[PDB]
Amino acid sequence: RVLQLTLGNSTITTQEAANSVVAYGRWPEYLRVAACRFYTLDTVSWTKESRGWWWKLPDALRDMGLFGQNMYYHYLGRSGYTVHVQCNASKFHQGALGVFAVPEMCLAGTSYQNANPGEKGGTFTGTFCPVDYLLGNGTLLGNAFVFPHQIINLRTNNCATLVLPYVNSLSIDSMVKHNNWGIAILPLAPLNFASESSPEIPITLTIAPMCCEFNGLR
Amino acid sequence: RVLQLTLGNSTITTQEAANSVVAYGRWPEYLRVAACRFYTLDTVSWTKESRGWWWKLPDALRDMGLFGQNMYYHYLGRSGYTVHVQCNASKFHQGALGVFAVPEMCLAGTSYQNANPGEKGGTFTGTFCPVDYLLGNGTLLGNAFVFPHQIINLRTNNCATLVLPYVNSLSIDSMVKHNNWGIAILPLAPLNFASESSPEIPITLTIAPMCCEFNGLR
Amino acid sequence: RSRSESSIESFFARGACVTIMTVDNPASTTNKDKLFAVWKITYKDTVQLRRKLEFFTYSRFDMELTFVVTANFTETNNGHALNQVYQIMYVPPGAPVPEKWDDYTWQTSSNPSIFYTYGTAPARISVPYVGISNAYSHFYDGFSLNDFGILAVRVVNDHNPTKVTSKIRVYLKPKHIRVWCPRPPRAVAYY
Amino acid sequence: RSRSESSIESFFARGACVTIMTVDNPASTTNKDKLFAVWKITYKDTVQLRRKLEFFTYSRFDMELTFVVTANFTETNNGHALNQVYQIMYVPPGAPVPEKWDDYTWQTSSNPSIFYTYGTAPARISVPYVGISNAYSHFYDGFSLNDFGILAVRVVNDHNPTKVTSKIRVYLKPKHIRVWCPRPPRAVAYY
Amino acid sequence: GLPVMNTPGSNQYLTADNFQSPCALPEFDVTPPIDIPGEVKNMMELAEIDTMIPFDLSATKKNTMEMYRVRLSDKPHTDDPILCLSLSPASDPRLSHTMLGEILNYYTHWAGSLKFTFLFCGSMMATGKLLVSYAPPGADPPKKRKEAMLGTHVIWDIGLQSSCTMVVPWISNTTYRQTIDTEGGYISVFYQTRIVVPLSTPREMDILGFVSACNDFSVRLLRDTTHI
Amino acid sequence: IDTEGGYISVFYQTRIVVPLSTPREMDILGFVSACNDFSVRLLRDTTHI
């Protein structure tokens, strides 16, 4: 089984949408078109020495196509997302990732360009760069599995999916000023591999806005 | 398909009960509760140099839980068994085992502690220790495939199952004095493996009495 | 089996002191600007309520404030004073705060005020949800904290001979709580 | 959408202080005619209520008066005094006003009087609409202001040894308001 | 008697309290009311009234009759606007003084739509085109006629209709804005065409400007800041 | 607080087999959670400074 998903002028090859977590059980919904497509970010290399990676949302897509154009040329907007993490590796690599979606992921070691990496995303550290096992804020990472999450354990699966509804104190809000979601991908178990295998496996993120809607155009 | 068998306070993970030989076609049967559970023995390491292994029954379970307690605190008893041999290896190992269940497996190079190894089981040799290709008694091992048997050929399967009914000249008999079955696991083809793979693969036995019944308690 | 005491209402709605506001009598000797006390309502000071609220991201709650006033003469001097009255003024969000003892805010119709007579039942009000947003944000990943209001306190009696200090304990009890989006709880470390 | 808080009742009916009436104890030392305090009820003093009423030309409203009495000894002297009682007399329109402490108006059956015992709940009455006209005129383009009444205040205890000053805050809350014929609101300039 | 238990809050006077109270004149027959014209049941009814915007708050113009008139003249056809009015009805000194602003100063929060109404007070003969633009919140106001035209706008014809009623919408992240500090939009009027006149008719006309809340407007959380 | 309650405990039944030069040092993680039958009572906040 190999599903070939499509959104407009974009196509993605998912092994299967078997493990697809919906954050807090709520599917994205409008308030009771073209921007909502697959935007695949620049891959990051997971090595033995990695501590983690993190992107914000909608900050990650501030430059991507219409979801960037609209996100600037409007004032207010809301959007759910579909973060698809593909971590294609061999059968002779081993490790685990924890993909955690975090509402209002306020990081701490704080000045807009600092907490808004954009497309490339930031990285954690193990002692700016926030701490890996803390997620910046003093917070034991074990308890981090409260958040909407999924485990990419290479021995069994090599891709996760996260459907994220719009989560904010407001019905609609300015996307330029204020992020809603924060994706953090941290290695629960370290990478390891056979003798001379590819020593750094790639992690790819495919973000797809869902129920993207904005007001008011200038 | 991964079946997860259970007997009381014990659970076993069988890949599939596809190849499950019933010795002589007869299922265990009472004479026309708690002791009947999974007792998993201490694993034995199959190397390149192995000649074979053998356990008796019910001698192997003389110390295991209630099937040992009862087996001593009673005088007469009968029991069928379910010997499950798991020989988990990689796809880069190769070899074959012959699991043979042998009624009245009288061995020969003879003094109770000698022919009653118990939990650990004995081993064969290639020249005490009985001979591998003879099974102690002068007996060509090829013809040994008359016995209730199954071949664990690592290229296709890596576990066998043997359902053993109660086989004796008597309806019921003293388990302390006299064994009924003898399991002998002999390498038909030798172990071999790729360059620096795990050089000795483990063989595990899970014995499960069936229709265990005894008289008379002291 | 019963999960009532682990309900949000039971876990949160529990009378917890959040400040101790000290005010002196308007004595005409040398008194500083300690004649009145002002405290912006905020849970970020008491660790118990804060650590319980930071389990969760968003929130909504009415806020029952009880006021326990306790006074005493300062000087060993032969102290005498008629029963004092305390103006406990709640200042809603976005409103001006008192700067002086005789500022106009103490006469503003907007600002609701309690007139607690000393030696009686503890004063009380019930602030409703006063959020512009539809939920109090405990964590906000954006650029330009939430305003609950201010509590100001003074003695009403003016030309008093003997000094009288007074502490106003504020027992805040959140009522009708709702909380969304749980989070890992912070250690007690950075509090 | 909701326009409740911009209703006339919500906009106007809010407890606002309108005066602070000071009275001294009938001490026999040298006390002047400060033994009693008199204040004609008028909104033309407090700017908040006045500026809100002068949005509109005519009006009608009951008038709930609350009285917060706060006393204190004047002298640093070893002050002692039993609990004082205050006569808070409302004088309707067209009635005579007290001239002296022991005038007859304090014994008149007409004039309703409250006897507030110090150190208890604030006194209160509810004056009804006392207008000869069918609406209070805030602006009148004619030739010959509206009379709401007078509030007089005294201490009832008479032969007191130690002086005791006392301030009576009058918190007027108009209730059941109606207003007609809106107008431009005055600047804060001439107030 | 009935055993009671006086709770906390007893004997306190909360100025926001609403209890019954004893009437001092209980035998007095109140003067009955009459049907006066003009009963106001709500304050927003006063903010729904088109009141005139003071555009020129300069040193001389202010506190006169000239502070309201916007003078259209004949001068080099500069792309800059005739007027640019920020939509901070409370935090804009021009709209702050209108009736709307006077009612908003009494409140903290507000939400709804505004309707602006410009009015040509020139000659019956004069003809021309103005362009009435509305930049939405967050936008930096239009500096040239082109930038304004591309956005929302109304080409008002001075010759045909003498007024132009553009209605602003309710765009805010919160359900309610504040009355103090941060954007809210910009009305702005440009010449599309320099105003034509016939014979010796004066080439200096005036436009007035009005503002009013709409039926969707609402305020909350009273905040009187009046003092001396 | 304080006295027993049991012990989870993980043993090797068989030393872990691997194919070719694959690393012979793996990791196991461990998770815990209450079940639907779980309940608590008598709140006791011990948080202070």
Side-chain angles (χ1 to χ4, degrees), chain F residues 6-28:
Chain F
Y7 299 93
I8 314 305
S9 62
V10 182
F11 303 78
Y12 306 87
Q13 181 64 67
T14 61
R15 70 198 313 162
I16 303 301
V17 162
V18 302
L20 303 141
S21 48
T22 304
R24 305 196 179 184
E25 295 193 350
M26 302 67 74
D27 307 68
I28 63 182

Tab-separated table of all heavy atoms in Angstrom, chain F residues 6-28:
chain	number	residue	atom	x	y	z
F	6	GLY	N	4.905	-3.673	44.682
F	6	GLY	CA	5.279	-4.575	43.618
F	6	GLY	C	6.505	-4.089	42.877
F	6	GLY	O	7.106	-3.064	43.203
F	7	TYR	N	6.881	-4.865	41.866
F	7	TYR	CA	8.083	-4.576	41.090
F	7	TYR	C	7.891	-5.057	39.665
F	7	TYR	O	7.707	-6.254	39.447
F	7	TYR	CB	9.303	-5.254	41.690
F	7	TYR	CG	9.646	-4.851	43.094
F	7	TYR	CD1	9.163	-5.561	44.172
F	7	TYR	CD2	10.475	-3.780	43.341
F	7	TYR	CE1	9.476	-5.203	45.451
F	7	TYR	CE2	10.794	-3.412	44.618
F	7	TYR	CZ	10.295	-4.131	45.672
F	7	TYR	OH	10.609	-3.772	46.957
F	8	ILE	N	7.957	-4.147	38.700
F	8	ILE	CA	8.215	-4.555	37.327
F	8	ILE	C	9.689	-4.888	37.235
F	8	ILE	O	10.505	-4.322	37.964
F	8	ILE	CB	7.839	-3.463	36.312
F	8	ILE	CG1	6.475	-2.845	36.590
F	8	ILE	CG2	7.838	-4.025	34.917
F	8	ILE	CD1	5.332	-3.804	36.678
F	9	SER	N	10.046	-5.813	36.358
F	9	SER	CA	11.456	-6.121	36.202
F	9	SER	C	11.693	-6.860	34.903
F	9	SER	O	10.975	-7.800	34.578
F	9	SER	CB	11.979	-6.938	37.377
F	9	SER	OG	11.327	-8.182	37.464
F	10	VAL	N	12.727	-6.449	34.183
F	10	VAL	CA	12.983	-6.937	32.834
F	10	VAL	C	14.306	-7.680	32.836
F	10	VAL	O	15.337	-7.127	33.236
F	10	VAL	CB	12.973	-5.796	31.809
F	10	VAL	CG1	13.200	-6.309	30.429
F	10	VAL	CG2	11.657	-5.111	31.846
F	11	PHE	N	14.268	-8.931	32.392
F	11	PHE	CA	15.441	-9.778	32.268
F	11	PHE	C	15.660	-10.126	30.807
F	11	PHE	O	14.734	-10.066	29.999
F	11	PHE	CB	15.295	-11.086	33.034
F	11	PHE	CG	15.015	-10.933	34.488
F	11	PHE	CD1	13.758	-10.625	34.933
F	11	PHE	CD2	15.998	-11.161	35.411
F	11	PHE	CE1	13.503	-10.504	36.259
F	11	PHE	CE2	15.739	-11.042	36.738
F	11	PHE	CZ	14.489	-10.714	37.160
F	12	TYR	N	16.884	-10.512	30.472
F	12	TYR	CA	17.112	-11.186	29.207
F	12	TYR	C	16.710	-12.642	29.343
F	12	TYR	O	17.197	-13.343	30.234
F	12	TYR	CB	18.575	-11.139	28.785
F	12	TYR	CG	19.261	-9.808	28.698
F	12	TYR	CD1	19.867	-9.248	29.800
F	12	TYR	CD2	19.374	-9.153	27.494
F	12	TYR	CE1	20.527	-8.055	29.711
F	12	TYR	CE2	20.029	-7.963	27.397
F	12	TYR	CZ	20.607	-7.417	28.509
F	12	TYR	OH	21.271	-6.219	28.430
F	13	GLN	N	15.825	-13.104	28.465
F	13	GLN	CA	15.667	-14.537	28.280
F	13	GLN	C	16.752	-15.046	27.349
F	13	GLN	O	17.295	-16.137	27.546
F	13	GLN	CB	14.280	-14.837	27.723
F	13	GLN	CG	13.961	-16.284	27.495
F	13	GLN	CD	13.953	-17.079	28.764
F	13	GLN	OE1	13.099	-16.886	29.624
F	13	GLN	NE2	14.909	-17.976	28.899
F	14	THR	N	17.082	-14.246	26.341
F	14	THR	CA	18.110	-14.557	25.366
F	14	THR	C	18.897	-13.298	25.068
F	14	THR	O	18.309	-12.236	24.861
F	14	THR	CB	17.505	-15.078	24.072
F	14	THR	OG1	16.660	-14.075	23.506
F	14	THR	CG2	16.712	-16.313	24.317
F	15	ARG	N	20.219	-13.419	25.038
F	15	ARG	CA	21.041	-12.292	24.641
F	15	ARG	C	20.692	-11.891	23.221
F	15	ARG	O	20.472	-12.739	22.352
F	15	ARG	CB	22.522	-12.635	24.754
F	15	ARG	CG	23.012	-13.636	23.731
F	15	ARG	CD	24.330	-14.248	24.162
F	15	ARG	NE	25.276	-13.225	24.607
F	15	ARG	CZ	26.354	-13.452	25.354
F	15	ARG	NH1	26.659	-14.681	25.764
F	15	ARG	NH2	27.137	-12.438	25.696
F	16	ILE	N	20.622	-10.585	22.992
F	16	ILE	CA	20.019	-10.071	21.773
F	16	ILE	C	20.903	-10.418	20.589
F	16	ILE	O	22.110	-10.151	20.592
F	16	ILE	CB	19.791	-8.563	21.860
F	16	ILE	CG1	18.923	-8.198	23.067
F	16	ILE	CG2	19.174	-8.082	20.587
F	16	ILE	CD1	17.559	-8.814	23.100
F	17	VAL	N	20.303	-11.000	19.583
F	17	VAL	CA	20.988	-11.373	18.360
F	17	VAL	C	20.894	-10.211	17.398
F	17	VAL	O	19.881	-9.508	17.348
F	17	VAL	CB	20.372	-12.649	17.762
F	17	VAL	CG1	20.738	-12.813	16.314
F	17	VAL	CG2	20.825	-13.829	18.536
F	18	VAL	N	21.964	-10.009	16.640
F	18	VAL	CA	21.967	-9.038	15.556
F	18	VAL	C	22.610	-9.668	14.333
F	18	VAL	O	23.440	-10.579	14.442
F	18	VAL	CB	22.715	-7.751	15.945
F	18	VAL	CG1	22.086	-7.142	17.154
F	18	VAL	CG2	24.173	-8.011	16.209
F	19	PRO	N	22.267	-9.183	13.157
F	19	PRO	CA	22.942	-9.611	11.939
F	19	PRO	C	24.333	-9.002	11.890
F	19	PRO	O	24.985	-8.863	12.925
F	19	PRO	CB	21.992	-9.105	10.857
F	19	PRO	CG	21.623	-7.842	11.352
F	19	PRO	CD	21.341	-8.089	12.818
F	20	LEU	N	24.815	-8.702	10.689
F	20	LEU	CA	26.083	-8.041	10.402
F	20	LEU	C	26.340	-6.812	11.273
F	20	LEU	O	25.566	-6.499	12.180
F	20	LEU	CB	26.054	-7.591	8.940
F	20	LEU	CG	25.824	-8.584	7.808
F	20	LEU	CD1	24.952	-7.971	6.744
F	20	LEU	CD2	27.128	-9.013	7.205
F	21	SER	N	27.379	-6.037	10.970
F	21	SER	CA	27.984	-5.027	11.842
F	21	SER	C	27.057	-3.999	12.508
F	21	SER	O	27.545	-3.019	13.077
F	21	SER	CB	29.018	-4.282	11.010
F	21	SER	OG	28.460	-3.913	9.764
F	22	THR	N	25.741	-4.186	12.389
F	22	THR	CA	24.735	-3.559	13.224
F	22	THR	C	25.222	-3.377	14.661
F	22	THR	O	25.903	-4.251	15.205
F	22	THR	CB	23.498	-4.451	13.238
F	22	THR	OG1	23.047	-4.679	11.900
F	22	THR	CG2	22.382	-3.857	14.024
F	23	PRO	N	24.883	-2.260	15.308
F	23	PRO	CA	25.385	-2.037	16.663
F	23	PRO	C	24.754	-2.993	17.655
F	23	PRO	O	23.556	-3.276	17.599
F	23	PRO	CB	24.984	-0.590	16.958
F	23	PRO	CG	24.480	-0.048	15.700
F	23	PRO	CD	23.975	-1.171	14.925
F	24	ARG	N	25.579	-3.480	18.574
F	24	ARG	CA	25.150	-4.406	19.606
F	24	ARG	C	24.767	-3.699	20.893
F	24	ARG	O	24.833	-4.308	21.966
F	24	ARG	CB	26.254	-5.429	19.865
F	24	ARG	CG	26.672	-6.153	18.612
F	24	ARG	CD	27.450	-7.401	18.881
F	24	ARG	NE	27.796	-8.074	17.634
F	24	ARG	CZ	28.418	-9.246	17.547
F	24	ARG	NH1	28.782	-9.915	18.634
F	24	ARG	NH2	28.682	-9.758	16.355
F	25	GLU	N	24.367	-2.433	20.806
F	25	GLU	CA	23.948	-1.640	21.957
F	25	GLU	C	22.658	-0.928	21.591
F	25	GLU	O	22.686	0.140	20.973
F	25	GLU	CB	25.020	-0.651	22.361
F	25	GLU	CG	26.277	-1.301	22.851
F	25	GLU	CD	27.200	-0.326	23.543
F	25	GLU	OE1	26.941	0.893	23.467
F	25	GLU	OE2	28.176	-0.779	24.177
F	26	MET	N	21.537	-1.522	21.975
F	26	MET	CA	20.225	-0.954	21.727
F	26	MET	C	19.696	-0.291	22.985
F	26	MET	O	20.303	-0.354	24.052
F	26	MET	CB	19.263	-2.032	21.244
F	26	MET	CG	19.722	-2.733	19.993
F	26	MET	SD	21.194	-3.714	20.272
F	26	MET	CE	20.454	-5.060	21.164
F	27	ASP	N	18.539	0.339	22.845
F	27	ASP	CA	17.891	1.050	23.929
F	27	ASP	C	16.431	0.649	23.989
F	27	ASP	O	15.792	0.426	22.961
F	27	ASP	CB	17.983	2.560	23.759
F	27	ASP	CG	19.399	3.041	23.545
F	27	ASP	OD1	19.976	2.734	22.483
F	27	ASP	OD2	19.937	3.732	24.434
F	28	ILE	N	15.917	0.552	25.209
F	28	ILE	CA	14.491	0.414	25.452
F	28	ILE	C	14.048	1.595	26.292
F	28	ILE	O	14.739	1.992	27.239
F	28	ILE	CB	14.122	-0.922	26.123
F	28	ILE	CG1	14.748	-1.063	27.498
F	28	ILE	CG2	14.567	-2.050	25.267
F	28	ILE	CD1	14.463	-2.368	28.182
